[PDB]
From a paper:
The [name] enzyme from [name], a representative of Class 3 L-asparaginases, is sequentially and structurally different from other known L-asparaginases. Asparaginases (EC 3.5.1.1) catalyze the hydrolysis of L-asparagine, generating L-aspartate and ammonia. [name] is a homodimeric protein, with each subunit containing a highly specific zinc-binding site created by two cysteines, a lysine, and a water molecule. Two Ser-Lys tandems (Ser48-Lys51, Ser80-Lys263) are located in the close proximity of the metal binding site, with Ser48 hypothesized to be the catalytic nucleophile.
The introduction of alanine at position 80 resulted in minor structural rearrangements of the protein in the active site area, which were nearly identical in the four protein chains. The [name] substitution affected the hydration pattern of Ser48, which is no longer surrounded by the triad of closely spaced water molecules. The Oγ atom of Ser48 is H-bonded to the Nζ atom of Lys51 and two water molecules, resembling two water molecules of the typical “triangle”. The Nζ atom of Lys263 is no longer able to interact with the Oγ atom of Ser80, but it continues to form H-bonds with the neighboring water molecule and the carbonyl oxygen of Leu264. The fully occupied Zn2+ binding site is conserved in the mutant structure. As observed in the S48A and K51A mutants, a sulfate ion from the crystallization solution is located at full occupancy near the metal binding site, forming H-bonds with the Nη atom of Arg47 and the main-chain N atoms of Gly188 and Cys189, as well as with several water molecules, one of which belongs to the metal coordination sphere. The [name] mutation turned the protein activity off, as the proton shuttling network could not function properly. Furthermore, the mutation led to protein aggregation, suggesting an additional role of Ser80 in maintaining the structural integrity of the protein.
Residue numbers in the entry:
A (entry chain B): 5 to 352
B (entry chain A): 5 to 353
Amino acid sequence: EDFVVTDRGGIVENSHRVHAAVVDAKGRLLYALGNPTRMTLARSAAKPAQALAILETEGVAGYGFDDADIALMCAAHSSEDRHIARTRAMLSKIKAEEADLRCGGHPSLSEMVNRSWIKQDFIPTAVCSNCSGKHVGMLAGARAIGAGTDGYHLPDHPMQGRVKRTVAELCDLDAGDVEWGTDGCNLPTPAFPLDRLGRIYAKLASAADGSDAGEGQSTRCAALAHIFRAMARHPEMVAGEGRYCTMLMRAFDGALVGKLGADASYAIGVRASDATRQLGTDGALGISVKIEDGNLEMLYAVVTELLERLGIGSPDVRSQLASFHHPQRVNTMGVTTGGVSFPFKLRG
Amino acid sequence: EDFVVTDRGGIVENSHRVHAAVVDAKGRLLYALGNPTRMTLARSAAKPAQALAILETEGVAGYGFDDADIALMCAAHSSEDRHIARTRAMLSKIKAEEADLRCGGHPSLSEMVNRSWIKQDFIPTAVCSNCSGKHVGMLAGARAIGAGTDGYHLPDHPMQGRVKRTVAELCDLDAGDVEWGTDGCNLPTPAFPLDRLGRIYAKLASAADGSDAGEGQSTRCAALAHIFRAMARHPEMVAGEGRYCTMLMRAFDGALVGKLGADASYAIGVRASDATRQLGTDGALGISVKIEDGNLEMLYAVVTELLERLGIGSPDVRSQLASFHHPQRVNTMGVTTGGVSFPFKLRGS
Ligand SMILES: [Zn+2]
Ligand SMILES: [Zn+2]
């Protein structure tokens, strides 16, 4: 019975089923909407796990990827010129070429960018892929271990072996409880219970907390903390101008990281704060969300509403997101015709 | 309940709740999915009832609207140049101007038309509205009874009083059982049980059957028959090139009319046929569908699946709709990554 709803003049137009998990740094379930263990394709929200697989590949350190490169590895970017430029710069660092990519072009995730492409009849290529940074990192990993760069995207390649292991490990799942399909960018892509997506991001944030504190860290926790700080420092690489993820991460100014998955999943890693303590946990927090029918506009409204209900942020921080929280319903003559409502109830 | 489901490598991606009603010519429920009486905003799918109100307005006959004009009154067109052109020619027939329209421009319902507008930096205006034909019809009726064109779109104008009474009468509902919001084109827009949307379209097809067969008809049934005929004859006016509605109606070549409502409603009126007799009725049939979350891609897939389940059309006729039936699920490198499935059973009365 957990829904987000749009109305016209009080009459229900559409309704969308919501699933959400709120977990602690061990993955213990604190709050939920809908079915918080729903088997769910993480899509682009898996990218911090895939970036960890890259950064844990021996020899990748020698290429000198910077924080903005790492953020782009974690990106579903808008294919802005700066994303394309950074993709080529990362290819140059590993002495590869666009022709070595195994992802393909697609209409930009930004409406404003895609409008400019349409105006020019532009044909996007591999380098414009929203996943281009993850693909450059996977090439780098393939080149670093000496495996061969053709086939780096294939499930029998050792780089995909590393990804599959790393995802199960962060999720704390046996390999048999993670399912695999193929993504738009033509990499294997994982599916696992929705709460475990929150667990991954809770572990990002927890690692960021330990790094910031000066605590001793395993090589994996060090790398997670690096991923968090890269995303939070360069949120415009993770998505782009006007994008929810970018506006979300700039508003919060290092307190959390957040990421979209295609077909309306979302994941947030919250560093330990007054808010998380108020929720009843002594460490970092993870949040995962899926809109059952895949509608992105409703995803962003639900994620902002959930941050409000969880007390994360302040009204002024969250207010930067106001156009997503309450999407505009204006007709062709400027008349408001209805709006969005949140008939769901968090359960503990 | 009843879902259309999309997968990626067999892993469930999205699922969409389906509502559908199959009704006979008197509105008796024959088959259903979901909640067949769901209160639903009919949106553009109510436009034949709005057309009926226009055509029943005293004196509208004197403008000489033709079959393609009536089709455009029933349309959610793609704002192709011919749709705009017919809108202006209809303004001319009633001696009105673009400045009289109270609908506004919007991005074209056709991705291909919208590509050309972006390239040309084109800003759509009132004459480009997908509802433009409806709005010229309502100007016409307003002027035909001397009620004035100013405010023709407002609930207190007698043309809108005529629309509201007419919607309830076609649905066979009391006035309080129809709810009203405001549409994207800035007209009043009705909400009523989904099966009643099927009833409107069954009444369309039924009247066309009666008209073809030479039966005595009231002015209203004669007018429903003209509406069906105008839509079936000019499916390109009702939508446009490449649009589901147009391709559907062309494939069936007069046997049915079909129309989209925004946020994924759909309605079909089916003329009496071997298919409909096999479904247990002696007359015409009406179908209405709503995808709960509003997804258009899923709507067209479900409607086409539902035609196959009902045996409506030859399997050869329906293969013209294959690309809508099972939408493409291929990635940026040409690899098929998933599909759509229909794990529901149509429940019969
Ligand atoms: Zn990808
Ligand atoms: Zn309209």
